[PDB]
Scaffold this active site. Structure first.
Site, PDB file in Angstrom:
ATOM      1  N   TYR A   5      37.708  36.332  45.534  1.00 21.91           N
ATOM      2  CA  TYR A   5      37.077  37.483  45.575  1.00 21.91           C
ATOM      3  C   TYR A   5      37.247  38.169  44.398  1.00 21.91           C
ATOM      4  O   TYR A   5      36.647  38.008  43.319  1.00 21.91           O
ATOM      5  CB  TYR A   5      37.395  38.587  46.513  1.00 21.91           C
ATOM      6  CG  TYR A   5      36.741  40.174  45.942  1.00 21.91           C
ATOM      7  CD1 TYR A   5      35.825  40.481  46.570  1.00 21.91           C
ATOM      8  CD2 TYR A   5      37.578  41.279  46.160  1.00 21.91           C
ATOM      9  CE1 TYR A   5      34.914  41.129  46.280  1.00 21.91           C
ATOM     10  CE2 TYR A   5      36.941  42.243  45.594  1.00 21.91           C
ATOM     11  CZ  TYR A   5      34.820  42.471  45.726  1.00 21.91           C
ATOM     12  OH  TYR A   5      34.807  43.283  44.933  1.00 21.91           O
TER      13      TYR A   5
ATOM     14  N   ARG B 266      47.541  49.671  42.260  1.00 21.01           N
ATOM     15  CA  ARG B 266      47.493  50.831  41.393  1.00 21.01           C
ATOM     16  C   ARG B 266      46.263  51.947  42.170  1.00 21.01           C
ATOM     17  O   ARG B 266      47.171  53.094  42.488  1.00 21.01           O
ATOM     18  CB  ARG B 266      47.629  50.800  39.948  1.00 21.01           C
ATOM     19  CG  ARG B 266      47.910  51.865  39.253  1.00 21.01           C
ATOM     20  CD  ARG B 266      46.587  52.995  39.490  1.00 21.01           C
ATOM     21  NE  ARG B 266      45.544  52.728  38.787  1.00 21.01           N
ATOM     22  CZ  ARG B 266      45.753  53.122  37.319  1.00 21.01           C
ATOM     23  NH1 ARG B 266      46.894  52.979  36.469  1.00 21.01           N
ATOM     24  NH2 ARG B 266      44.212  52.089  36.984  1.00 21.01           N
TER      25      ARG B 266
ATOM     26  N   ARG C 256      37.433  52.489  50.917  1.00 19.24           N
ATOM     27  CA  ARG C 256      36.950  51.103  50.295  1.00 19.24           C
ATOM     28  C   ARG C 256      39.204  50.643  50.193  1.00 19.24           C
ATOM     29  O   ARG C 256      39.701  51.518  50.317  1.00 19.24           O
ATOM     30  CB  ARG C 256      37.104  51.239  48.781  1.00 19.24           C
ATOM     31  CG  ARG C 256      35.585  51.207  48.777  1.00 19.24           C
ATOM     32  CD  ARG C 256      34.881  50.579  47.491  1.00 19.24           C
ATOM     33  NE  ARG C 256      34.374  51.968  46.365  1.00 19.24           N
ATOM     34  CZ  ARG C 256      33.923  52.768  46.291  1.00 19.24           C
ATOM     35  NH1 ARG C 256      32.989  53.170  47.149  1.00 19.24           N
ATOM     36  NH2 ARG C 256      33.496  53.455  45.825  1.00 19.24           N
TER      37      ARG C 256
ATOM     38  N   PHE D 232      42.266  42.008  21.804  1.00 20.91           N
ATOM     39  CA  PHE D 232      41.013  42.103  22.782  1.00 20.91           C
ATOM     40  C   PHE D 232      41.432  42.078  24.009  1.00 20.91           C
ATOM     41  O   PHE D 232      41.524  42.623  25.538  1.00 20.91           O
ATOM     42  CB  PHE D 232      40.207  41.418  22.317  1.00 20.91           C
ATOM     43  CG  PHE D 232      39.173  41.924  23.605  1.00 20.91           C
ATOM     44  CD1 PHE D 232      38.594  40.542  23.906  1.00 20.91           C
ATOM     45  CD2 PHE D 232      38.232  43.335  23.961  1.00 20.91           C
ATOM     46  CE1 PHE D 232      37.694  40.816  25.143  1.00 20.91           C
ATOM     47  CE2 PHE D 232      36.842  43.259  24.641  1.00 20.91           C
ATOM     48  CZ  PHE D 232      36.746  41.699  25.165  1.00 20.91           C
TER      49      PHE D 232
HETATM   50  C1  LIG Z   1      34.810  43.457  29.800  1.00 21.57           C
HETATM   51  C2  LIG Z   1      33.241  41.967  30.408  1.00 21.57           C
HETATM   52  C3  LIG Z   1      32.867  41.439  29.439  1.00 21.57           C
HETATM   53  C4  LIG Z   1      33.400  42.727  31.497  1.00 21.57           C
HETATM   54  C5  LIG Z   1      33.846  43.660  32.757  1.00 21.57           C
HETATM   55  C6  LIG Z   1      34.091  42.953  33.845  1.00 21.57           C
HETATM   56  C7  LIG Z   1      33.171  43.968  35.059  1.00 21.57           C
HETATM   57  C8  LIG Z   1      32.362  45.101  35.432  1.00 21.57           C
HETATM   58  C9  LIG Z   1      33.499  43.183  36.132  1.00 21.57           C
HETATM   59  C10 LIG Z   1      32.972  43.901  37.201  1.00 21.57           C
HETATM   60  N1  LIG Z   1      33.629  44.048  38.859  1.00 21.57           N
HETATM   61  C11 LIG Z   1      33.905  45.238  39.062  1.00 21.57           C
HETATM   62  C12 LIG Z   1      35.582  45.180  38.679  1.00 21.57           C
HETATM   63  N2  LIG Z   1      36.195  45.888  38.252  1.00 21.57           N
HETATM   64  C13 LIG Z   1      37.950  44.918  37.986  1.00 21.57           C
HETATM   65  C14 LIG Z   1      36.955  44.876  36.271  1.00 21.57           C
HETATM   66  C15 LIG Z   1      37.528  45.618  34.855  1.00 21.57           C
HETATM   67  C16 LIG Z   1      38.245  46.876  35.437  1.00 21.57           C
HETATM   68  C17 LIG Z   1      39.701  46.519  35.191  1.00 21.57           C
HETATM   69  C18 LIG Z   1      39.607  45.279  35.952  1.00 21.57           C
HETATM   70  C19 LIG Z   1      38.976  43.768  35.614  1.00 21.57           C
HETATM   71  C20 LIG Z   1      40.239  45.400  37.432  1.00 21.57           C
HETATM   72  C21 LIG Z   1      38.495  46.128  37.637  1.00 21.57           C
HETATM   73  C22 LIG Z   1      38.146  47.529  36.966  1.00 21.57           C
END
Ligand SMILES: CC(C)=CCC/C(C)=C/CNCCN[C@H]1[C@@H]2C[C@H]3C[C@@H](C2)C[C@@H]1C3
Ligand SMILES: CC(C)=CCC/C(C)=C/CC/C(C)=C/CSP(=O)(O)OP(=O)(O)O
Ligand SMILES: CC(C)=CCC/C(C)=C/CC/C(C)=C/CSP(=O)(O)OP(=O)(O)O
Ligand SMILES: CC(C)=CCC/C(C)=C/CC/C(C)=C/CSP(=O)(O)OP(=O)(O)O
Ligand SMILES: CC(C)=CCC/C(C)=C/CC/C(C)=C/CSP(=O)(O)OP(=O)(O)O
Ligand SMILES: CC(C)=CCC/C(C)=C/CNCCN[C@H]1[C@@H]2C[C@H]3C[C@@H](C2)C[C@@H]1C3
Ligand SMILES: CC(C)=CCC/C(C)=C/CNCCN[C@H]1[C@@H]2C[C@H]3C[C@@H](C2)C[C@@H]1C3
Ligand SMILES: CC(C)=CCC/C(C)=C/CNCCN[C@H]1[C@@H]2C[C@H]3C[C@@H](C2)C[C@@H]1C3
Lengths: 341, 341, 341, 341
Positions: free
Chosen positions: A136, A183, A195, A255
């Site tokens: 997942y 967290r 969730r 980054f």
């Molecule tokens: C940085 C670019 C190019 C995309 C972001 C990736 C995106 C929005 C994934 C959608 N899926 C939700 C899961 N979100 C996860 C990602 C973003 C936050 C930090 C990390 C990784 C743990 C979750 C909260």
């Protein structure tokens, strides 16, 4: 042009801190990463919208990428807050997308589709095993790593050898997702509907029902499960390190490194800590301000990671169950760091 | 006329045992308690299903009773077996319901809503204390007792003074519900998710985890708890005896007395019996036939209760923790029984 | 030391017997134990003065131990006779206290504090259950057991292993407290206002009003309640035996054994003895002299406990309701006794 | 809106003062406290009618809470003044009640039933001991304290932790009931039948007949006994300030504080005053208007409580029988207060 500005504004609104991290990148890279973020963001809104039919999501997502061409498409009536807007005014997004390096567009479309379908898979079944868990995370965050790594190569700032094997790039994604999934246990379990992300295969050994951890009558087995989640997350550290050490450009590094260091710090704070079960454990802004400041080059980010992983190790005692295991994974991490120092 | 036949047929299919007891009553009132049975069974099924949103129930259950006045209402897909058949063909119940005495119709409706709301309360939280335990049983069975005593009075078969104080009737319900919960410990804890009813206030004195009672190792602590549980139930006997001794009608008595005797018989068998923790303890078919045959008049059913209560006491030793408590509660049951001979 | 003498003089005035038994100890530890005794006795004087308001007790008890390091401190309006003199001249105790080793001062202070708090809790409520009974006894008697054990270790006379598990030590204070509560029933219930220690959970099975035991009318059930109480004190015998057998020092041994043997002798006397309900049952001065004389070494005291335990059993027969309960407990004690012969 | 208006109309007609205090509460909360008040008032009206046979009360009171679900239930021959209109038009309350919110309904339902059962306990006996007095106070006022606290929590205005220990909530109720039972001694005794609340355990130390206190003859003892009653009441002050200090919401605070301050001012006025025996002592309208205005936050209400306790203290001379005890009670109160300044 006002499309580009819209994307950056919605981003500043949708993800506060990441809107700072992305500023490390140069406009070219910056433009693609911002587009890429919103695309996946919209996609994430649909999957999480509990107020709409599933069969609808399954018939949408698989072709969500296709829309990356229709500069008139949009979805008014989905999600909440800013997200809803992002969809209703999704036109500017595609309008910006349209004018990005051809290569960039392929990574976005590619990754988007892969993630979309991946989301569908888990939209029907549930996560019970650790294998479900990791898979997942792969679809949710790992793929972001793949995509960002493919963007790095494309741009030309990083050597093409970086995209050869994406195993570690995947680890970067998972490590962030798991740290966040740990967290936010409480915040997420309180949702309506609740969730849940923690894999049945791990918590089953500490309780009969997940919601039980809300009541400290079960702290004992609550934290003990927490430590097991933190342990399952540490597995990735060694790979995050390698990946970081392979990066050569000062932009891509900062980054890529800052978020990883932020997660390790967070992880060293939620470990063996019951507060996780009734509130949001967070790092202080001083700490994140310092992380954002010194995470610009390998050596310095390695000493920070070390420092945090060591502090996490101090959190426990011989008494604690997970000891032998944590001590292990920790030393596996410090070793990884030392071989690049 | 086809509607009633449907009820008795599905009734027969679902709670086969009770289906025989109800046949004891005269057709008029018989239809009442039959439809009454089905309504609560329909409700129980809804609340039951583990593949339905809590939020759904918390909203739909409290309004269930309102459907009794809508011959068109039915439910599509929930609860396997014949239960399914009830909620989908619930139509035939409402119909039959419509042609019953207004008083009857009101009793059924009143109890229903009170029960649904009681179930809702316990959907959100668990049974932790003896109060929780006594209250949960009150909602799912004690009220059934309240309802049956009202139908009795409403019917004229019993003297209006019977429904003056519903405390003893509540005891009747509790006595059956607890014997069951005690007897079905294993079958219930082996469910997915596990069904737990024994209150923490009681078992926490014997173990830190209830699932420990599935292993021979903890056999000593399991039993002690089983006995503490049996002691809690015996608290009701004196009252049951009181209630049965207050019934004046033969038909209502036999119908009220038979289940009670069956329960004491079951109690005398599960008490201080380690098999409770791996199998379903039950009386022999010959014994129940014997009970159904004689529990038709006070004196006979009292000496059968007496007999079982005595058989119960003869299973414990002077060296079992429960000695004093049981011996007391037993001697107390018998006194109330002798008080009517 | 005008102080250390006042202590012993008040000791003798307040408790003739203990003043003779404490002489088995060597000076050092004797002074410690004498002081310890007076401190706790002072706490007793306060918790027991029914003329003073509870607000006063709940205010003064919790901070009594603080007075130990406050010479010049005293209390002038509480208690009767010598006890009253004890408090009004408490300065003689704190002074003496001050000249004791820190190891001793600390145990005395610790135990004092925890007993005060125990007393404050049972001042707010009453003893209803066996658990309440056992705990109250733990607060006013068992704790003294713990204290003596720590002192024995702190002095070096006994090996530190003695303080590993203070459970048997608790059983020691509990056996004396219970045999005493059993024997002083009449005297206690006759005071103004009446004093009650037998727990409801035990006598509620024989009467609705404990005052009924004063009338011959209810003699038969009174004797059954007394025997149940005895059954309850016999639980501790096996442990008292273990504890006595673990002692290596002659002085500590004699000092610890004599009261236990006295208690067993007394218990064997009040058992199944209706006279307990109108007078104070005691052993002959000849027998208490014999007991003081031989309780110097394990074997001899072991055979005396056996003899009294056999006398106890011999005072019952088949018809007696308690027969089984009692015969069981006896053999369990005999076994533990022979288990060291 | 009609049902809800009838409730506020009858409330004002029936309990003038509380009708004002309740306006310190906001919306949903005020409605719930309103219904709560009326329900307990209706109950109290039935329990207090002397033309109603005991057997009936003993059977009707424990079922009262059950009428809350019956939107047609009402009574027609009971009550004085508009208390009759209340029971006659109870359908308004029950109807308004049905629209409160599950959480509020259960608090009200539970407390009603508990109060009802407690009243039955005292319909068969009387208050003789200090413990009886407290239990009685708990049943009629203490429980209201429990009920109000639960309603605060259930509203979200106060932290959920507020209900973890309802001890201080009990003291809050007890301070009000006792101050009231004291101030109204004469009015109470001057009725047919005479109303007596002062516990025998306290007044028998001052007289053999309570009426004796109407004569300026036995006056001397009347006041000495009055003072004892006040001392028993001052016991709760430290706990009352603890409660008030733990509230966070301004409305809830004002609502909770005003009555407590009124009680302390009244108490400081009835203390050591012979008039209590032939007139109803009151505070000046100006004083009560000052209390209503300033009891809006902790610091100011503590300042006022302080003022009234010291004013109480300064009404006794060293030669008074109650001097030392009142002085301590007073100091306990003041220390407590400072503890929050
Ligand atoms: C940085 C670019 C190019 C995309 C972001 C990736 C995106 C929005 C994934 C959608 N899926 C939700 C899961 N979100 C996860 C990602 C973003 C936050 C930090 C990390 C990784 C743990 C979750 C909260
Ligand atoms: C470079 C590589 C191989 C992999 C990158 C790994 C991934 C999935 C990165 C996305 C980073 C983001 C969006 C961080 C948010 S800051 P935060 O964590 O504090 O939380 P926020 O989203 O601001 O609410
Ligand atoms: C008269 C009165 C005051 C109270 C009656 C008490 C109650 C709640 C009676 C319901 C009786 C039933 C349905 C028994 C089923 S036989 P079983 O227990 O063997 O199990 P089954 O439902 O047949 O699967
Ligand atoms: C050694 C150990 C671990 C525990 C000892 C247990 C306790 C609490 C012992 C105190 C012994 C006392 C004061 C006996 C009194 S002799 P008596 O019963 O004849 O009556 P008296 O107090 O002299 O009036
Ligand atoms: C918040 C908390 C923990 C406890 C509250 C304590 C209780 C039981 C309060 C009831 C308050 C009332 C009805 C005051 C009326 S003033 P009055 O007596 O002078 O006049 P009245 O006749 O009652 O209208
Ligand atoms: C007899 C009429 C009119 C109704 C039956 C009451 C009904 C179906 C309650 C639903 N609640 C689930 C718990 N079921 C319990 C009841 C039925 C079985 C025997 C008793 C009582 C113990 C449990 C198994
Ligand atoms: C021997 C040292 C150090 C203290 C004496 C213990 C002390 C007086 C405790 C105060 N709590 C009253 C309970 N007193 C009991 C103990 C003394 C007497 C015999 C036993 C045990 C039954 C009661 C009368
Ligand atoms: C504050 C809400 C919700 C209800 C009031 C509680 C209610 C009507 C109790 C009936 N029980 C008689 C005891 N009455 C007492 C209470 C009311 C008045 C002031 C205080 C406390 C002393 C007495 C007169």
């Amino acid at each position: 042009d006002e499309d580009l500005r819209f994307c950056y504004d919605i981003l500043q609104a949708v993800s506060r801190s990441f809107a700072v991290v992305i500023m490390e990148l140069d406009e070219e890279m910056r433009d693609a990463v911002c587009i890429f973020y919103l695309v996946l963001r919209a996609l994430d809104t649909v999957e999480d919208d509990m107020s709409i039919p599933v069969e609808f999501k399954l018939r949408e997502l698989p072709k969500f990428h296709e829309h990356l061409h229709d500069t008139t498409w949009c979805m008014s009536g989905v999600g909440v807050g800013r997200e809803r807007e992002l969809l209703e005014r999704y036109t500017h997004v595609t309008r910006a997308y349209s004018r990005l390096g051809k290569a960039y567009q392929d990574v976005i479309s590619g990754i988007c589709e892969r993630m979309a379908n991946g989301m569908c898979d888990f939209l029907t079944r549930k996560v019970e095993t650790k294998a479900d868990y990791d898979l997942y995370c792969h679809y949710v965050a790992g793929l972001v790593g793949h995509g960002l790594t493919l963007l790095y190569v494309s741009s030309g700032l990083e050597d093409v050898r970086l995209a050869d094997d994406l195993t570690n790039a995947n680890h970067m994604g998972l490590f962030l997702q798991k740290t966040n999934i740990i967290r936010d246990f409480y915040e997420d379990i309180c949702e309506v509907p609740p969730r849940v992300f923690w894999p049945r295969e791990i918590w089953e050994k500490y309780t009969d029902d997940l919601h039980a951890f809300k009541d400290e009558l079960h702290e004992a087995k609550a934290v003990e499960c927490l430590n097991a989640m933190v342990a399952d997350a540490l597995v990735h550290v060694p790979h995050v390190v390698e990946y970081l050490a392979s990066l050569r450009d000062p932009s891509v590094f900062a980054f890529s490194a800052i978020p990883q260091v932020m997660a390790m710090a967070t992880l060293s704070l939620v470990f063996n800590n019951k507060d996780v079960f009734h509130t949001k454990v967070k790092t202080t802004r001083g700490a994140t301000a310092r992380i954002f400041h010194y995470s610009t080059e390998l050596q310095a980010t390695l000493q920070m990671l070390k420092t945090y992983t060591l502090r996490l190790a101090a959190r426990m005692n011989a008494q604690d169950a997970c000891y032998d295991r944590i001590e292990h994974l920790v030393n596996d991490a410090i070793r990884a760091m030392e071989s690049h120092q």
